[PDB]
């Protein structure tokens, strides 16, 4: 009537995908990314903060901590291409971060409904850090700070933020 029907029709079946020869491999880090290395954060709310590199995790990110008591940065994950590895180090020989992993830092599957509600009434959000997480931070900080105290200006260094100044040339500057 309105349009002549086709003599044949394309199949609705979807062809199976071919075997993909792309096996996974471990993340290779830069030579300077060695646990204890103080890192400069280049992204996120903690941009400009200095943190101690504690442990590479399963998702290819790095586990870091300010320490929190030292400069406000909590134990958390950070993507390695957003950090500057400095020559300053904090020993992590007495720091046990083996209990921390990707699942530990996984977030709750917030639903769309809940997201909408949060957007509608953000003032009703009452986030709270798990008691465990608080105590975990205390342990990590304790160990790191004990080592930090060996250098009289190190705690101050970590407390201070990082920012480029007029005349600075990052491609010539060393860390």
UniProtKB/Swiss-Prot annotation:
Superkingdom of this protein's organism: Eukaryota
Keyword flag Methyltransferase: no
UniProt cross-references to PROSITE patterns, sorted A to Z: RIBOSOMAL_L6E
Gene Ontology terms describing biological process: cytoplasmic translation; ribosomal large subunit assembly
Residues with PTM N-acetylserine: 1
Ubl conjugation in keyword set: yes
Cross-link (Glycyl lysine isopeptide (Lys-Gly) (interchain with G-Cter in ubiquitin)): 127
Keywords: Acetylation, Cytoplasm, Isopeptide bond, Phosphoprotein, Ribonucleoprotein, Ribosomal protein, Ubl conjugation
Membrane-crossing segments per the record: none
Compartment(s) where it occurs, according to its Swiss-Prot or TrEMBL record: Cytoplasm
Gene Ontology molecular function, alphabetical: RNA binding; structural constituent of ribosome
InterPro entries: 60S_ribosomal_eL6, Rib_uL2_dom2, Ribosomal_eL6_CS, Ribosomal_eL6_KOW, Translation_prot_SH3-like_sf
Post-translational modification Phosphoserine, affected residues: 11
A cellular component term, taken from the record's GO annotations: cytosol
Post-translational modifications reported in the UniProt record: N-terminally acetylated by acetyltransferase NatA.
Pfam family, one: Ribosomal_L6e
Additional record remark: Present with 37100 molecules/cell in log phase SD medium.
Function: Component of the ribosome, a large ribonucleoprotein complex responsible for the synthesis of proteins in the cell. The small ribosomal subunit (SSU) binds messenger RNAs (mRNAs) and translates the encoded message by selecting cognate aminoacyl-transfer RNA (tRNA) molecules. The large subunit (LSU) contains the ribosomal catalytic site termed the peptidyl transferase center (PTC), which catalyzes the formation of peptide bonds, thereby polymerizing the amino acids delivered by tRNAs into a polypeptide chain.
Subunit (UniProt): Component of the large ribosomal subunit (LSU). Mature yeast ribosomes consist of a small (40S) and a large (60S) subunit. The 40S small subunit contains 1 molecule of ribosomal RNA (18S rRNA) and 33 different proteins (encoded by 57 genes). The large 60S subunit contains 3 rRNA molecules (25S, 5.8S and 5S rRNA) and 46 different proteins (encoded by 81 genes).
Family note: Belongs to the eukaryotic ribosomal protein eL6 family.
Record protein name field: Large ribosomal subunit protein eL6A
Organism: Saccharomyces cerevisiae (strain ATCC 204508 / S288c) (Baker's yeast)
């Amino acid at each position: 009537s309105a349009q002549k029907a086709p003599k044949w029709y394309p199949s609705e079946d979807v062809a199976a995908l071919k075997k993909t020869r792309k096996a996974a491999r471990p993340q290779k880090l830069r030579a300077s990314l060695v646990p204890g290395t103080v890192l400069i954060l280049l992204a996120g709310r903690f941009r400009g903060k200095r943190v101690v590199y504690l442990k590479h995790l399963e998702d290819n990110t790095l586990l870091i901590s300010g320490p929190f008591k030292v400069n406000g940065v909590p134990l958390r994950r950070v993507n390695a291409r957003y950090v500057i590895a400095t020559s300053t180090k904090v020993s992590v020989e007495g720091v046990n971060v083996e209990k921390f992993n990707v699942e530990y830092f996984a977030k709750e599957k917030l639903t769309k409904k809940e997201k909408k509600e949060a957007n509608l009434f953000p003032e009703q959000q009452n986030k709270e850090i798990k008691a465990e997480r608080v105590e975990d931070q205390k342990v990590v900080d304790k160990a790191l700070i004990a080592e930090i105290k060996k250098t009289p200006l190190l705690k101050q260094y970590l407390s201070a933020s990082f920012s480029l100044k007029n005349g600075d040339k990052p491609h010539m500057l060393k860390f």
